[PDB]
Design a binder for these strands. Structure first.
Lengths: 124, 185, 262
RNA sequence: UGCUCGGCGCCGGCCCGAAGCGUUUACUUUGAAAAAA
RNA sequence: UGGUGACUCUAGAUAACCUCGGGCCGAUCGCACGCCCGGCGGCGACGACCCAUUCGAACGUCUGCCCUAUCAACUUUCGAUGGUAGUCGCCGUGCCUACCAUGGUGACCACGGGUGACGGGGAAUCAGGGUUCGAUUCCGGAGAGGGAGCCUGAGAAACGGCUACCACAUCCAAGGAAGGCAGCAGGCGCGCAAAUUACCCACUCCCGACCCGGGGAGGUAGUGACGAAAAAUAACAAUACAGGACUCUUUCGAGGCCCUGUAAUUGGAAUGAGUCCACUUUAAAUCCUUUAACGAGGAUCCAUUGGAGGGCAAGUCUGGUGCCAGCAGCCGCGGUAAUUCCAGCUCCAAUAGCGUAUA
RNA sequence: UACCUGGUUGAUCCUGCCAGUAGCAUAUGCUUGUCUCAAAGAUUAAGCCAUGCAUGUCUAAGUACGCACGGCCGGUACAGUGAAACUGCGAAUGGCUCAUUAAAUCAGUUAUGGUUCCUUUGGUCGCUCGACUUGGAUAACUGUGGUAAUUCU
């Protein structure tokens, strides 16, 4: 029903990863979510679906062909090594602290209102 | 300092004399048989034709057997024959000066739809182009002011998701079928 | 201003960079190095554009700091290191090597080279100097100071320097009949044979170099490089070979390539 | 427009090339130098 | 020895000097560990006088800047002009001192004044030739109320560094402390005139001991009819009927299948706005696209702007006041039969756009 | 697209001006469905600012006796992470505006043979003829105070 064809396949072996350009062909249906896209891409490359970080999917006028990117690693530690943090957050591998930068700005100002070890307890 | 383009240009142009009889009659005529929305579209077409005739004027101003003139002329006639406003036999450098607005408006998508026999009227052709019913080399086209190339002329067909050329019925026939089965029992 | 500029605008860079116009408002300003600002090529733009190995400014830092890059046989760690003309790029993990040479137009181009060719580097002398105790000193185009050179090296001579050691191996004298390379200006990146040179006192000397296809031109003396002894080049040439092939027959060869492709 | 060194050539000799110089101006013609948008 | 078109060039030799407010000739730190017989060894990091190189900065040479004569002579030993000798300066030089002579510029417009003057790369108009603007994202120059002076640092006369002035102005137990949004948002004042006290370093670069931190540099979102680009507001079928397209009836009459056009007659085919599920995008959303379920017969899912005498496309239409109210960029329309006033109908022009005033 | 038109007369030809025509960018008015870009306190006030933010920084490789955590056989010092503080680095970049300035700035071209240059790159670094590690001051910290307060001491 929905097929994937490889395009611009290049193997930058030093990054322990391979890059390829994703186009998704599907007639008369909605935009396909990335989960079974990752599953079918992993089944095509004989890999378990855990080292794939796809992003940037745009839909053409008509929706018969949607473009995208395709990414595969070789190991989970290498995927943890050189990867943007937001892709890990989308995959649920890295979490960030939830305060805004404004609160951190007045926090840093409240530490710099004093000197010494008083910075440890003026900003809680 | 921002990452902005800030480039634009006017596409139409206004004439000097607003109130007149003759040129109003020919533009109202060509809207009559070609089915245009308003005067701004033919103002854009006239501005584009004036630009290409002006460019042909300084191209023919330069002397014969000049490299940039020959290159620009070959590229211009290749573009003019690939859009289809000329024909493949008559490649001469000064015959660009002898064409008018109807040659520009002949390669419009509405004219191709009307002359290909898949539409009833030019107004019907316009409302059917605006409603995304045509695939052109497997691509859904909406814009009525579309320039059709000569090699991309035999691939005009109904879109595969349209009910006219084969597909699912739309909202209204489904509504009529639903009210028919509701009133049947 | 009150000091040196640490920023570079996106449109402030010259054309041989070949950048875009919307992906950034700032351009990567190269660090200070052996080569000047206008003619240079940093690691970041070359890696993220010419090879497309990295897509992110953090990604090019990750591809650079892991000590997999060789510049003149030496591992570097700067992301804005200026690598200009006749510089070698070696990648041990991938297994291919590159040498930075100009194309037939005013830009750099990639060039895969054999590893045994990547053991020497051509250099052009700027001046002949004497040291504090009669020691003859030499300055190349990348400011590589060489002590005790050959006495037959002059101001506008070109030399061959081994990459792994840094000693003088071979040299080419500057006279008419040698194969030439032009570096700098509108008339850039071309291959020809020097035939005529006249001397201007107190001005910029102009030389006359004939192309192999009979084309004639003249450029300044400071934009002259020698890459061969006579007619045989010591360096492998890229595709095109610096003819400045003219516009209507790139049009003809592009139409030929389109009809041959189908 | 010509009078000290050497060149494609030949048996103290001819030709060619050239260190050196051979009225200033504007204009005309060809090149380089000429930031990006 | 070597080089420049050219050194009082570099190098070579000689005699000394060599600053205690003081030039160098490593008393620094990590990694892997060892050979030989206590000594002996690699990969680095940091620092360091000297050079060349790199980012440059700086003073210079030639050429090019708006108007004004109700600006015709200007500057001078309180340096204007150059020479000699010095001081200072990173060097070159009246930059400045001591002594000399009176010099230097100007009708080819100096000197003087004004500029609603930051300059250029450029923008509008544009047959050609031209006119106006350029505060404004690129480059360079100036300053952070205005002058003045200075520490640090390679690089500052720095103002999100300091010192004193006046003007403004914060707090106070009255002795004294603390100030510069012509930065990002926001307020007052001003005026015809100009937006959120928003999110984020993810993308592009920048600073730091540095993969790892920070950046109102910037990116994102909203306000946004400055301006530009694309682009909704239906069509087919049958009935409302004037006859042409071709043959004929002297003319009506008929053959009339494309008929062409218009009436709130009927008929089905449909897609969008919007309501929203999902998905995509994104630091995370919103925006766009795809796709469910919906969603139009006065498609009430209702298109405005100034006009209708001429210039200048459009009613001698109707009713009301009748030199009053008014219209009118200009001619001129109003005095009891208003092709121009005021209201209704119709019609013309551009169309989500149109009109008015300033340049 | 290298363009005119009405207006002095009883009527006619001319100089001549006025007014219509088109664009550009400022304000304002009327009106308003979709969608892609996108200018925006500059003309008067380079006038005054309450507030919040805008410049910080550690690797194996400069100082670690903060149990603030934390590994054991602990005894010939320091496992490791480490707030704080000393130290060098940049804070002279970037951003806003056009108030001054009329051979001034700036543009093209030139020279520093009349000077400087953080950092990077390359070299120099037993080239001189005479200790198997030297000395005391300060942080941080602990404890003690005045001020109405500061990024005070």
């Amino acid at each position: 029903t929905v097929t994937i064809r490889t395009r611009k396949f290049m193997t930058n072996r030093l990054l322990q990863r391979k890059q390829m350009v994703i186009d998704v062909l599907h007639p008369g249906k909605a935009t396909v979510p990335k989960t079974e896209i990752r599953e079918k891409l992993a089944k095509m490359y004989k890999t378990t679906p855990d080292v794939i970080f796809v992003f940037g999917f745009r839909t053409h006028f008509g929706g018969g062909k949607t473009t995208g990117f395709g990414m595969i690693y070789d190991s989970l530690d290498y995927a943890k090594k050189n990867e943007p943090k937001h892709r890990l957050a989308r995959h649920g591998l890295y979490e960030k602290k939830k305060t805004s930068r404004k609160q951190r700005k007045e926090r840093k100002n409240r530490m710099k209102k004093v000197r010494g070890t008083a910075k440890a307890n003026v900003g809680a | 300092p921002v990452a902005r383009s800030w480039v634009c240009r006017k596409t139409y142009v206004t004439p000097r004399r607003p109130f007149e009889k003759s040129r109003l009659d020919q533009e109202l005529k060509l809207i009559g048989e070609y089915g245009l929305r308003n005067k701004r579209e033919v103002w854009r077409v006239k501005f584009t034709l004036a630009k290409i005739r002006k460019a042909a004027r300084e191209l023919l101003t330069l002397d014969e057997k000049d490299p940039r003139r020959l290159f620009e002329g070959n590229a211009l006639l290749r573009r003019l024959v690939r859009i289809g406003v000329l024909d493949e036999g008559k490649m001469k450098l000064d015959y660009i000066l002898g064409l008018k607005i109807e040659d520009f408006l002949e390669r419009r998508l509405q004219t191709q739809v009307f002359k290909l026999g898949l539409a009833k009227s030019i107004h019907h052709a316009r409302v059917l182009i605006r409603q995304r019913h045509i695939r052109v080399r497997k691509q859904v086209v909406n814009i009525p002011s579309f320039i059709v190339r000569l090699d991309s002329q035999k691939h005009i067909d109904f879109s595969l998701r349209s009910p006219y050329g084969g597909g699912r019925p739309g909202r209204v026939k489904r509504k009529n079928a639903k009210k028919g089965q509701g009133g049947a029992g | 201003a009150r000091g040196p500029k640490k920023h570079l605008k996106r449109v402030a860079a010259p054309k041989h960079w070949m950048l875009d116009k919307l992906t950034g408002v700032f351009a990567p300003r190269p660090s200070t190095g052996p080569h000047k600002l206008r003619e240079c090529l940093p690691l970041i733009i070359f890696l993220r554009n010419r090879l497309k190995y990295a897509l992110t400014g953090d990604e090019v830092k990750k591809i650079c700091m892991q000590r997999f890059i060789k510049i003149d046989g030496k591992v570097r760690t700067d992301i804005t290191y200026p690598a200009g003309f006749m510089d070698v790029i070696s990648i041990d993990k991938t297994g291919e090597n590159f040498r930075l040479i100009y194309d037939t137009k005013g830009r750099f181009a990639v060039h895969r080279i054999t590893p045994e060719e990547a053991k020497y580097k051509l250099c052009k002398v700027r001046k002949i100097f004497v040291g504090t105790k009669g020691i003859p000193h030499l300055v190349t185009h990348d400011a590589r100071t060489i002590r005790y050179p050959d006495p037959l090296i002059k101001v506008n001579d070109t030399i061959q320097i081994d990459l792994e050691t840094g000693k003088i191996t071979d040299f080419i004298k500057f006279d008419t009949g040698n194969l030439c390379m032009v570096t700098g200006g509108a008339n850039l990146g071309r291959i020809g044979v020097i035939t005529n040179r006249e001397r201007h006192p107190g001005s910029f000397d102009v030389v006359h170099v004939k192309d192999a296809n009979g084309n004639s031109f003249a450029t300044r003396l400071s934009n002259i490089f020698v890459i061969g002894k006579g007619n045989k080049p010591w360096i492998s040439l890229p595709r095109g070979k610096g003819i400045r092939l003219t516009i209507a027959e790139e049009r003809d060869k592009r139409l030929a390539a389109k009809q041959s492709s189908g």
